[PDB]
Design a protein around this ligand. Structure first.
Ligand code: 3PE
Ligand code: SF4
Lengths: 155, 305, 72, 98, 68, 93, 82, 171
């Protein structure tokens, strides 16, 4: 067949982009100690083929963690533009989803989803590294449920 | 025949480099008290292929852009040709000098990358790393020029018949303590990996090529040590045994590199160049003079077939 | 009740023995080798890692996460 | 032998032209000097190994070392020039005509 | 524990052991049970070209003996 | 022919890798650096002079080779020590 | 006393130079001492990288032998007796 | 594989020609590296293994490295590229055509002099010691340690002085 093996090929390339995940840990504030605790032994981010840290130009995922102010927004959008396609994003914390306890302040971006798009959301102040892993696995699944080759071969 | 042998020499070494990336991850994890990759496949024997597919999937002067990584990788692969295991693919007198040349060249790639990237930021680190690499390759060459006087020939086969009885470490260990270090600079490994420590232009593909060549050079310098200073057993009926012991000692050195990368901090550039210029070069010259005198105030002046 | 760190109880000596130990530790790298030994120790230990979806960390009844209204 | 030798001499002449004519730089001149030196070392080693002579081989080594040092001092001068003017151009040296 | 690295250690071991024995056995298959001769000098090359000329086949992996 | 084969093979393999990469998806001066490069030269030249010992040693004028080696090494070390004392290995600007 | 103090200082402050200079001295000095030095030149003279062209006997030279295996020539037995 | 030396020779010619037609230095240094490579290969084909490897190790690794180093750290390829490279490329093409036709002209007047084309492969090695060890350039270059010591001491002094000269210059 053709469509069968095309679906299988898409599933395999998704296997790749699902295992070889490299983050840029844009952790501004106290939603960062938890990323570090996660890459720590007891949960071992790397175990899932997910390196502790790495530069953007070779990265795939981008973890936002912390209040997103009006002086560190530009830099963030710059990084998300510099990064190479595909580029997946993960918001990690109240401050970065809805401005958290600083929503009604004057020097906050009330949601990183205004600056940048998003593929996953995570709640907390802070979250628990376990919930963070669960978000990342939701991301792996949001990957595994893609059909690029199918949509092209029926474009 | 020959194409078969070149395949046997090129495919397995790429396989080993991949699984060496793996072994690095695993040992670093086990020394930092974590596991490491255990998921993508049984005990993590698929993460490397995963990384390959991912990189080749990532989107991005073409001349430099291509010739630099290609050049580096080709040099790193050719470095393997003249090695004895135990009878080599290409027996070359002056083989180790060919090695040194083809190892020094990659500086051209390092430098073209910078001269292309207009980033002053990039030229900064490029110059720094180029200078350290140069300065350490100097001693990497002098050590051989001071040891090989034990076998009056730049070949790489004579090493074996020499070490038949004894090794080359019980003597010359004032050198092995160096040849096991400069190898950590030409490779830009730790504790001299500042070239990747201070960051403020390698895309996915060319990064894969650079890293391939890096770990290839790792394996190869470790093999060179295992051949020079850790002479294996050449019982002519057991080339298999030779290759086997060589494998063992190469793995041992390649795990020592990782002990190091995990344990130690990094060297500040100035402290590093101080280290070289004011600790290794005087010792190196004096020890070379020592090994020059040894075969004169001792009968041990070797032959040249 | 204060203290003193990074200071010798008095002036040192110039003993050939002390200079010898200093020279040795500067050449053969005893302390660095000790660090390598420590890393080896931790290598040969049990890792604290756990499989998350099949093993989940400890807690206490006082947690604070998802919300829930209730009923009689 | 004769063909390759005439071609090497041609290459020497071409480096000569490169040095005797400029294009608003100095590193080009010095690199053409290096090309000269390379051609000469090659022709000398070729002559030696073709005559099977040995005692005459130290000469390429000697002249290669001397060319290395010569180009080194030339680069030092180029650098002083760039650091006292602002670039390595050639048309800045309009002085000394008075 | 530390007994989970063998599935990479043994892999690298075999894939670094293969080239040596490969080369040896291949050279031997070609040159007929005896290893590949080497010529660091013109002497051995003269010997080899002599054996080539007298092989009767124009290949040097043939040692004749006393029956010539 | 053998090295030609090997090198062409390696180059073509690398270029296959890079073509895959491209198809599958679809300043002031620091005098110190120049001084260091110069030291590197003036040492490589010593290396060129010094390599031939494995054949200069099997001659009969040991009283000559021993000497000339000591001479080269010691005078090079003298130049090195002078550079040091005159602060070519300090890096502080 | 000043020398002794300086060396007792250097042997903790900067040994590298001490080791280097001691090695240098040993190298320059031992060749003048050891007895096994000349033997090297003797060996490398013995080693026949070329052919020993013979001569005639139109005279009364009694030193040179009429045969290799004869004893009338220069011996080197000390080589194996070494 | 008979035209070997002639090919290497023409390529060295072309490298020196690309240096004489002064291009942008970044695209001239490649010509120089090619020139050195091909010249060393010629030496090797003749039989100077030691000399060729000495070149690879010193010329390239020692001199071209520092040339690029100094160039980058002390030069800027200002926008003098008004298609200058694209012009001198066609100029180089015209020159190489001139040279090809020049040799095809010469071969008529001169046959056993400038170049012997019908028998080009011949006339590279003239004699050789078939049964002789110790006939490689290693011995000639080692001479300096037994005879011709003047060469070694002179080079030593050249370096001993070049150090002082460079340092006293840079200040
Ligand atoms: C006849 C024979 C004559 C007698 C000779 C005796 C033995 C000679 C020993 C030769 C080796 C000398 C190496 C050496 O001297 O290293 C010194 C170096 C310190 O140098 P420095 O930069 O000045 O900093 C020290 C400040 N206190 O130390 C260092 O800082 C180097 C740090 C190295 C980091 C890498 C560690 C790798 C450890 C691997 C061990 C090998 C397995
Ligand atoms: S949500 Fe809470 S834990 Fe996270 S960055 Fe904001 S204040 Fe810190």
């Amino acid at each position: 067949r053709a469509e069968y093996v095309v679906t299988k090929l898409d599933d395999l390339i998704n296997w790749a982009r699902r295992s070889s995940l490299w983050p840029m840990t844009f952790g501004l504030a106290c939603c960062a100690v938890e990323m570090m605790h996660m890459a720590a032994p007891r949960y071992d981010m790397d175990r899932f083929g997910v390196v502790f840290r790495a530069s953007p130009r070779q990265a795939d995922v981008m973890i936002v963690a912390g209040t997103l102010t009006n002086k560190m927004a530009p830099a963030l959008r710059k990084v998300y533009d510099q990064m190479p396609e595909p580029r997946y994003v993960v918001s990690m914390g109240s401050c970065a989803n809805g401005g958290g306890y600083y929503h009604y302040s004057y020097s906050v971006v009330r949601g990183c989803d205004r600056i940048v798009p998003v593929d996953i959301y995570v709640p907390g102040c802070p979250p628990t590294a376990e919930a963070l892993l669960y978000g990342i696995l939701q991301l792996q699944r949001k990957i595994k449920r893609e059909q690029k080759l199918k949509i092209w071969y029926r474009r | 025949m020959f194409f078969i042998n070149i395949l046997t020499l090129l495919v397995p070494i790429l396989i080993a480099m991949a699984f060496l990336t793996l072994v690095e991850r695993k040992i670093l994890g086990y020394m930092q008290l974590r596991k490491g990759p255990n998921i993508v496949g049984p005990y993590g024997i698929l993460q490397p292929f995963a990384d390959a597919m991912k990189l080749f999937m990532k989107e991005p002067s073409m001349s430099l852009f291509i010739i630099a990584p290609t050049l580096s990788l080709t040099l790193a692969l050719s470095l393997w040709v003249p090695l004895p295991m135990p009878h080599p693919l290409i027996n070359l007198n002056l083989g180790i000098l060919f090695i040194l040349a083809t190892s020094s060249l990659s500086v051209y790639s390092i430098l073209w990358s910078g001269w292309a990237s207009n980033s002053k930021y990039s030229l900064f680190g490029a110059l720094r790393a180029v200078a350290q690499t140069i300065s350490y390759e100097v001693t990497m060459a002098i050590i051989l020029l001071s040891v090989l006087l034990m076998n009056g020939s730049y070949s790489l086969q004579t090493l074996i018949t020499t070490q038949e009885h004894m090794w080359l470490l019980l003597p010359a260990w004032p050198m092995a303590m160096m040849w096991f270090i400069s190898t950590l600079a030409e490779t830009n490994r730790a504790p001299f990996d500042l070239t990747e420590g201070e960051s403020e232009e390698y895309a996915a593909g060319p990064f894969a090529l650079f890293f391939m060549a890096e770990y290839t050079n790792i394996i190869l310098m470790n093999a060179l040590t295992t051949i020079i200073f850790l002479g294996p057993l050449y019982y002519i009926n057991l080339p298999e045994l030779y290759s086997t012991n060589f494998m063992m000692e190469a793995l041992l050195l390649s795990s020592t590199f990782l002990w190091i990368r995990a344990s130690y901090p990094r060297f500040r550039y100035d402290q590093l160049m101080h280290l070289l210029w004011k600790n290794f070069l005087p010792l190196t010259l004096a020890l070379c003079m020592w090994h020059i005198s040894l075969p004169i105030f001792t009968a041990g002046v070797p032959p040249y077939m | 009740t204060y203290k003193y760190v990074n200071k010798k109880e008095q002036e040192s000596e110039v003993d050939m023995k002390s200079a010898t130990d200093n020279a040795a530790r500067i050449l053969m790298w005893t302390e660095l080798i000790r660090g390598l030994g420590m890393t080896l120790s931790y290598l040969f230990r049990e890792p604290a890692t756990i499989n998350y979806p099949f093993e989940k960390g400890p807690l206490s009844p006082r947690f604070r996460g998802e919300h829930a209204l209730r009923r009689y | 032998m004769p063909s390759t030798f005439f071609n090497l001499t041609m290459a020497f002449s071409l480096s000569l032209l490169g040095t005797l004519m400029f294009r608003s730089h100095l590193m080009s001149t010095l690199l053409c000097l290096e090309g000269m030196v390379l051609s000469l070392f090659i022709m000398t080693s070729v002559t030696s190994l073709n005559s099977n002579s040995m005692s005459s081989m130290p000469i390429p080594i000697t002249i290669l070392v001397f060319a290395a040092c010569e180009a080194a001092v030339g680069l030092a001068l180029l650098v002083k020039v760039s650091n006292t003017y602002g670039t390595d151009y050639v048309q800045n040296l309009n002085l000394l005509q008075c | 524990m530390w007994f989970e690295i063998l599935p990479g250690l043994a892999i690298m071991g075999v894939c670094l052991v293969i080239p040596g024995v490969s080369t040896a056995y291949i050279h031997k298959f070609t040159n007929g049970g005896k290893e590949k001769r080497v010529a660091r000098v013109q002497y051995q090359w003269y010997l080899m070209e002599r054996d080539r000329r007298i092989s009767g086949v124009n290949r040097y992996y043939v040692s004749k003996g006393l029956e010539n | 022919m053998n090295l030609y084969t090997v090198i062409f093979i390696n180059i073509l393999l690398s270029l296959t890798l890079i073509l895959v990469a491209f198809w599958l998806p679809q300043l002031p001066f620091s005098m110190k650096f120049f001084l260091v490069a110069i030291t590197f030269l003036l040492f490589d030249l010593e290396i060129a002079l010094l390599l031939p010992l494995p054949w200069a040693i099997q001659t009969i004028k040991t009283s000559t080779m021993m000497i000339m080696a000591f001479i080269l090494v010691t005078i090079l070390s003298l130049g090195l020590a002078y550079e040091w004392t005159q602060k070519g290995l300090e890096w502080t600007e | 006393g000043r020398i002794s103090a300086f060396l007792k200082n250097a042997w903790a402050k900067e040994p590298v130079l001490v080791v280097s200079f001691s090695v240098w001295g040993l190298a320059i000095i031992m060749p003048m001492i050891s007895p096994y030095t000349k033997y090297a030149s003797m060996i490398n003279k013995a080693t026949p990288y070329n052919y020993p062209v013979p001569v005639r006997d139109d005279g009364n030279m009694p030193d040179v032998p009429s045969h290799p295996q004869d004893p009338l020539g220069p011996s080197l037995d000390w080589l194996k007796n070494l | 594989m008979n035209n070997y030396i002639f090919v290497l020779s023409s390529l060295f010619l072309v490298g020196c020609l690309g240096l004489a037609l002064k291009p942008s230095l970044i695209y001239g240094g490649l010509g120089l590296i090619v020139s050195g490579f091909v010249g060393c290969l010629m030496v090797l084909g003749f039989g100077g293994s030691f000399l060729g490897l000495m070149v690879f190790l010193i010329y390239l690794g020692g001199m071209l490295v520092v040339f690029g180093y100094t160039t980058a750290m002390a030069t800027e390829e200002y926008p003098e590229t008004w298609g200058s490279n694209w012009l001198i490329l066609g100029f180089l093409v015209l020159g190489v055509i001139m040279e090809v036709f020049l040799i095809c002209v010469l071969n008529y007047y001169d046959e056993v002099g400038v170049i012997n084309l019908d028998g080009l492969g011949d006339w590279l090695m003239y004699e050789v010691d078939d049964v002789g060890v110790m006939l490689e350039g290693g011995i000639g270059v080692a001479a300096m340690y037994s005879c011709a010591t003047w060469m070694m001491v002179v080079a030593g002094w050249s370096l001993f002085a070049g150090i002082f000269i460079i340092i006293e210059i840079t200040r």
